[PDB]
């Protein structure tokens, strides 16, 4: 007859993690196998003393006092969830016992200084952090926020995550915590408006936080939730009297969150240490149960409990005098510890290394919730960074959301309506200018031959034509050309502006100068300032325009105009898209303009006022001339008043969408039209007459 020994066990069957409903039969499938094979235990049987606990520390403490002070002497203890496992492991040092857990996943249970006689088969919970960080780099985010329940099982995991997220640039922004009532953290998370949320709490707190996240509209299109994976399959479709929400007010609340879990079963087809494959165990266990395998709590953690007996059986067979074990002798406990430390084999979950910092499994599993059903997106591997994606995720609009951003927008203007009208109005006149020039050339001048020489009139005609042909460099912008050759666009503008005004204005001003100075002066004029030849007017025109050439060439080679961006106020509504518009407008300017433009405009304006004074002081005296001085006086008056009114306006208005272009274009076109028609209607009149 074989002697019998006893072990102690706590099986949680309710509460934050109901596991015993799938864990109590599995051990009952193992013990009947370990007490029936004469190879592994020749003269001993193992018996179990189980107690329900709900893994609450009060009932756990009561049942622990009940267990430790009874007549059958125990050998090992087997706790349940982590809140009981840590308490048992801390307290078992005064009785010289051995704690062997099968469901605890606390990262803080690796510190061997506080827990000397503790062993576990469940892997560490730091295996989720190499996955989630990867999922933060594929979709490109940098600002997240966490919310946790203040138990050390989640506190150590949050510490490990915030330690391992620093090596990828991502940084935490907002932290929250709660002990029993999560209303205030959810309120603060809504008022602070975070977008990426990571949750760390038990199963029973998930409903008591989601019924309070539904009442503040913290879901929908621009919020992402990361959760845990070992929950039940239908954890929101159950009746809970401690909340006020209804099932259709939560099914729309939990739509679109991301869950990650760890696999716990060898997917291959091998032969184990117990002559059983990796799916016959699952089939036999599902036959042994009574309810459906989809809703039985803790179904994934069954092979761990099936291996936790076999490992101790092999260790105790390696030791193989187990009838006088007291509660105050050390010399047996260190022997059993050294025999257990050097054990390794293959079981149902794989190879049991049994002494590391965890991490004897490799893979993970990622899932999403769609329409009230779970779907597996894709697996992951930790070492070789393998990520076997499958493209089975449906966001809103075919694209995942992001954080808040800001777009940059340059201005344009009416590139068709206001611009093509100016272009056709310029093209209507640029050809009339040259055909009137041709008419001045080829027509047999008789009255004009009696009048002044028409070369200084061809100068005026070419000048107003070249002044009119300067709207095309003014309307173009970054819509077409303004990327690289913008300085040549400014060059075209400035060269055309500097030429086309100066040539025609000088060719009129010298005629009005002579027609003033010839008539009534007898002091000193005979062959003065020039010769008689048309080279007189040509040379004074050349001096006047050469001045302008020096003015352009000094600050075109000393201080050119490259480019300048101006940025003002922002936050357009942007048509209900989560984006913020920033408008700017670019234009061609140097570092200094209000000095050069001012001095050049004043130097030209004094000459313009002198010209209109010299044009007014002679009105109705004429000899040997047909119609020149009256016509050039009227034209110079019109050009003078139009330029003096228009030019100081375009410097003030910087909003050049429809003001600064329109004023300059209207002034140029009207001045050119009036000058041409008034100067060269009477030649055609007296030629047809």
């Amino acid at each position: 007859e074989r002697r019998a020994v006893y072990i102690g066990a706590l099986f949680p069957m309710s509460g934050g993690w109901p596991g015993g409903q799938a864990c109590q039969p599995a051990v009952e499938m193992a013990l009947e196998d370990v007490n029936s094979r004469r190879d592994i235990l020749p003269d001993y049987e193992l018996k179990l003393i189980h107690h329900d606990s709900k893994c609450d520390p009060g009932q756990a403490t009561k049942y622990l006092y009940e267990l430790l002070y009874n007549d059958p002497i125990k050998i090992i203890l087997m706790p349940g969830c982590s809140s009981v496992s840590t308490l048992v492991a801390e307290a078992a040092r005064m009785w010289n016992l051995i704690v062997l857990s099968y469901g605890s996943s606390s990262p803080a249970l690796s510190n061997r200084q506080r827990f000397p006689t503790f062993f576990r088969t469940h892997p560490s919970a730091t295996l989720h952090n190499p996955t989630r960080v990867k999922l933060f780099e594929k979709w490109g985010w940098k600002k997240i926020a966490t919310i946790q329940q203040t138990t050390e099982v989640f506190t150590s995991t949050l510490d490990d995550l915030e330690e391992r997220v620093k090596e990828a640039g991502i940084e935490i922004t907002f932290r929250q915590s709660f002990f029993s009532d999560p209303a205030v953290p959810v309120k603060n998370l809504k008022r602070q408006d975070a977008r990426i949320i990571v949750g760390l709490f038990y199963e029973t707190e998930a409903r008591k936080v989601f019924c309070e996240v539904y009442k503040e509209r913290l879901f929908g299109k621009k919020y992402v939730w990361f959760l845990i994976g070992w929950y039940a399959d239908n954890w929101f479709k159950i009746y809970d009297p401690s909340i006020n929400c209804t099932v259709d007010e939560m099914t729309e609340a939990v739509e679109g969150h991301i869950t990650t879990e760890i696999v716990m079963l060898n997917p291959a087809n091998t032969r184990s240490i117990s002559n059983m494959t990796s799916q016959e165990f699952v089939e036999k266990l599902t036959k042994r149960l009574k309810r459906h395998p989809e809703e039985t709590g803790g179904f994934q953690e069954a092979p761990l409990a099936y291996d936790a007996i076999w490992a101790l059986a092999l260790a105790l067979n390696k030791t193989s005098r187990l009838e006088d074990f007291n509660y105050n002798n050390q010399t047996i406990t260190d022997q059993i510890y050294r025999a257990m430390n050097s054990s390794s084999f293959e079981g149902v979950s794989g190879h049991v290394v049994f002494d590391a910092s965890g991490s004897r499994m490799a893979w993970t599993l990622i899932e999403q919730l769609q329409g009230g059903s779970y779907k597996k997106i894709g697996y992951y591997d930790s070492t070789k960074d393998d990520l076997s994606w499958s493209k089975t995720d449906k966001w809103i609009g075919g694209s995942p959301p992001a954080d808040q951003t800001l777009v940059i927008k340059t201005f344009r203007f009416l590139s068709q309506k206001l611009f093509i009208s100016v272009s056709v109005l310029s093209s209507l006149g640029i050809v009339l200018a040259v055909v009137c020039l041709s008419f001045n050339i080829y027509n047999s001048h008789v009255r004009y031959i009696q009048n002044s020489q028409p070369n200084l009139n061809n100068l005026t005609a070419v000048g107003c034509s070249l002044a009119l042909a300067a709207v095309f460099p003014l309307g173009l912008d970054g819509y077409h050309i303004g990327r690289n050759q913008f300085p040549f666009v400014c060059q075209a503008r400035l060269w055309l502006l500097g030429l086309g005004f100066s040539l025609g204005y000088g060719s009129m001003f010298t005629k009005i100068w002579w027609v003033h100075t010839v008539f009534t002066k007898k002091e000193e004029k005979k062959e003065w300032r020039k010769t008689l030849e048309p080279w007189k007017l040509y040379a004074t025109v050349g001096l006047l325009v050469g001045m302008d050439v020096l003015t352009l060439a000094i600050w075109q080679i000393v201080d050119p105009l490259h480019r300048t961006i101006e940025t003002f106020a922002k936050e357009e509504p942007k048509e209900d898209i989560d984006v913020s518009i920033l408008p700017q407008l670019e234009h061609c300017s140097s570092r200094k303009m209000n000095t050069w433009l001012g001095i050049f405009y004043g130097y030209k304006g004094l000459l313009l006022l002198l010209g209109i004074f010299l044009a007014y002081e002679t009105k109705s005296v004429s000899t040997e001339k047909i119609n020149d001085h009256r016509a050039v006086g009227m034209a110079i008056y019109n050009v003078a008043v139009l330029c003096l009114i228009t030019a100081p306006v375009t410097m003030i208005l910087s909003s050049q969408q429809d003001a600064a272009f329109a004023f300059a274009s209207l002034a140029i076109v009207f001045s050119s039209y009036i000058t041409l028609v008034v100067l060269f209607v009477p030649k055609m009149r007296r030629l047809i007459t």
Binding site: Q59, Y69, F179, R191
Partner: protein, 696 residues
């Protein structure tokens, strides 16, 4: 008499860090038992106290608890527990044996949830008795904008979660909420950028040095801020934060001047007033007996809060034992195998009510917690001083004046002041333009003098005396418009602004109409006299009648608008608030207007009718240009005038309609547009006849 015994757990040895606390409170309770034993309120029984050891160890504590349960007599209550872990471990599992716990040193805030700690009472104000008191302090200084800065642990998050529920209902709002874990002054910059001025902090002793070092670099001190920091730290906690100089980025003398005058909130060890309490001595008497009772053991700060727990237990036992039943109530006190639920209920419900004046005031409970007393301290001259008090059952706040002070000369403010300001016209500009308009008025007076003086001298064209007088009166009537434009809200006081804006258009349009009509009537008369001919006067006042009809119809055009359709002020603002010249009062600009909801209309009709008048004048100039009449008629001056007026008006209207955000340039534009046009018109009209009459 048969005895009844109660369990007690506290550190005793010297090899632990919290043993002296027990040795600080063991003589005091050693007095209180004697105070019972000489009177014996529990007359047929006798009180007994058993003592055990915890040593602030989970394993040793649970072993001692289990050994006291297994090898001990029948116990009734458990009294004690000072270490913040073994106390919670014991208290979470009291329903299994039906016992009641009374603590005197567990001040952790998590023990207030009575949904899983039903059998736990304490006689010491916890860390949740700070949240009401702070609120009352705000009602002594009127601060309604606060920001919180907390660590992230359990005990430092329970207070921040309770603060929201405390400060709900009143008119106080939490502006910011930040939280750090290891680097405190990454969120201090966020608090600086949000511009808060009252700070409530919750952090331990280690992070306080880092917070006060990082707050000195960002310049968040002086007479502009106020810090509320917990004050249960040990004395001289700053002189030993750095053994070596390994606390750089902040020096000593640039830290003592950084943490100046913060407010520390704690509880109070004893009572300030004096009556005869339930024992029979004054609190000063009891303090004397405790101070000469111990021999050489140093004093503690829990020796007062433990002397009252024994009397609480004694009064509870006396008020629960002597119920209506006698025989069963004296028989059921030795069969207590820690399973009797009725005895546990009859102990708990009698323990719920207690009310007497002990040594720390009244001893009253609320949902398990205790109503106590709160003490305020301030950091002054590198030292801490007690400055106030806050009762809890009477809900009053007493401030000991002649002690508190501030760095400035008044309490600081919660936020800066927002000041709205109007944008006015430059007074030199107004003076210059008014002087120029006055000079133009004097020139117009001279011109009218000339027109009336030689009206019948040398036959100067013998045409339009009255019409020229009407033209120059129209110009004089138009100058009052530019007299009238440059108003300001400070000079109208909202008294006549709703009327001047709608009579400005009246006077301007009347002047315009009468000027152009009296201009065109002359040329109409010259065209009338040279047709349908022997000539004479054709009309003495019929032309005056028809220009009056034109002015009347275009004035009724205006007047038939102000019967249902208004046009009044809509003052707008531009919140781009800068600083003043060195000051801190944030000012915003706002400017007034005189607009309507139909500003794009009521302009095209009047502009089109003025264009029709211009076209009629063009017809008159056409009819008079082909005459080549002597100086009595004029067809060139009128054309020059209309060409110089129309272009300038059609430019100036569109220019002045655009520049709305620059109120000091559109006045200068409209003034020049009016004055140049009127001067050019008067000069083209009068002086050609004037030079001819002067030549004669």
């Amino acid at each position: 008499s048969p005895p009844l015994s109660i369990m007690g757990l506290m550190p005793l040895t010297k090899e632990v860090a919290k043993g002296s606390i027990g040795r600080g409170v063991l003589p005091a309770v050693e007095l209180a038992i004697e105070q019972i034993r000489n009177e014996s309120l529990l007359r047929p029984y006798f009180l007994d106290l058993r003592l055990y050891d915890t040593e602030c160890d989970n394993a040793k504590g649970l072993k001692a608890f289990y050994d006291a349960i297994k090898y001990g007599p029948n116990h009734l209550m458990v009294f004690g527990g000072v270490c913040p872990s073994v106390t919670s471990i014991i208290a979470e599992s009291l329903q299994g044996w039906n016992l009641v716990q009374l603590s005197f040193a567990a001040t952790t805030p998590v023990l207030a949830d009575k949904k899983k700690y039903p059998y736990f009472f304490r006689t010491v104000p916890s860390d949740n008795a700070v949240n009401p008191a702070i609120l009352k302090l705000l009602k002594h200084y009127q601060w309604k904008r606060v920001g919180t800065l907390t660590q992230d642990v359990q005990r430092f998050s329970e207070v921040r979660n309770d603060l929201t529920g405390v400060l709900y209902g009143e008119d106080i709002e939490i502006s910011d909420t930040e939280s750090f874990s290891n680097d405190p002054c990454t969120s201090v910059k966020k608090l600086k950028g949000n511009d808060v001025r009252i700070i409530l902090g919750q952090f331990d002793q280690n992070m306080a040095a880092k917070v006060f070092c990082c707050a000195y670099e960002e310049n968040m001190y002086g007479s502009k801020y106020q810090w509320i920091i917990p004050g249960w730290y040990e004395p001289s906690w700053w002189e030993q934060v750095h053994t070596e100089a390994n606390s750089s980025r902040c020096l000593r003398k640039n830290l003592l001047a950084a943490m100046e005058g913060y407010i520390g909130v704690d509880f109070e060890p004893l009572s300030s007033k004096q009556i005869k309490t339930i024992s029979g001595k004054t609190p000063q008497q009891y303090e004397r007996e405790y101070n000469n009772k111990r021999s050489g053991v140093g004093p503690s700060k829990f020796h007062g809060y433990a002397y009252d727990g024994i009397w609480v237990i004694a009064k509870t036992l006396q008020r629960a034992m002597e119920t209506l039943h006698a025989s069963s109530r004296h028989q059921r006190i030795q069969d207590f195998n820690y399973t009797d639920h009725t005895l546990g209920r009859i102990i708990l419900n009698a323990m719920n009510e207690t009310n007497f004046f002990g040594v720390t005031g009244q001893v009253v409970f609320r949902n398990g917690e205790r109503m106590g007393t709160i003490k305020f301290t301030q950091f002054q001259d590198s030292r801490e001083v007690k400055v106030g008090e806050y009762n809890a059952v009477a809900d009053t706040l007493e401030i000991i004046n002649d002690t508190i002070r501030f760095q400035g000369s008044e309490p600081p403010k919660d936020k800066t002041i927002i000041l709205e300001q109007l944008r006015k016209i430059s007074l030199p500009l107004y003076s210059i333009l008014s002087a120029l308009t006055i000079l133009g008025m004097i020139m117009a007076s001279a011109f009218l003098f000339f027109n009336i003086k030689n009206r019948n001298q040398k036959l100067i064209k013998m045409s339009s005396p009255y019409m020229n007088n009407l033209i120059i009166l129209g110009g004089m009537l138009s100058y009052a418009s530019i007299f009238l434009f440059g108003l300001d809200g400070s000079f109208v006081s909202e008294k006549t602004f709703e009327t001047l804006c709608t009579v400005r258009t009246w006077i301007l349009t009347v002047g315009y109409t009468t000027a152009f009509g009296a201009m065109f009537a002359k040329t109409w008369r010259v065209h009338a006299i040279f047709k349908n001919v022997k000539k004479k006067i054709i009309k003495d006042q019929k032309l005056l009648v028809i220009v009056g009809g034109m002015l009347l119809i275009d004035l009724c055009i205006l007047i038939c608008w102000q019967a249902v359709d208004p046009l009044r002020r809509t003052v707008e603002k531009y919140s781009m608030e800068p600083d003043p010249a060195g000051r801190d009062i944030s000012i915003r600009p706002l400017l007034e207007h005189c607009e309507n909801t139909h500003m794009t209309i009521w302009l095209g009709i009047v502009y089109a009718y003025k264009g029709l008048l211009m076209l009629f004048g063009c017809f008159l100039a056409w009819e008079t240009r082909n005459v080549s009449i002597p100086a009595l008629n004029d067809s060139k001056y009128i054309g020059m005038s209309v060409y110089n007026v129309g272009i300038m008006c059609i430019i100036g209207a569109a220019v002045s309609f655009l520049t709305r955000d620059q109120p000091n340039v559109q006045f200068c534009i409209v003034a020049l547009v009016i004055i140049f046009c009127s001067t050019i018109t008067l000069c083209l009209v009068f002086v050609p006849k004037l030079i001819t009459l002067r030549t004669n």
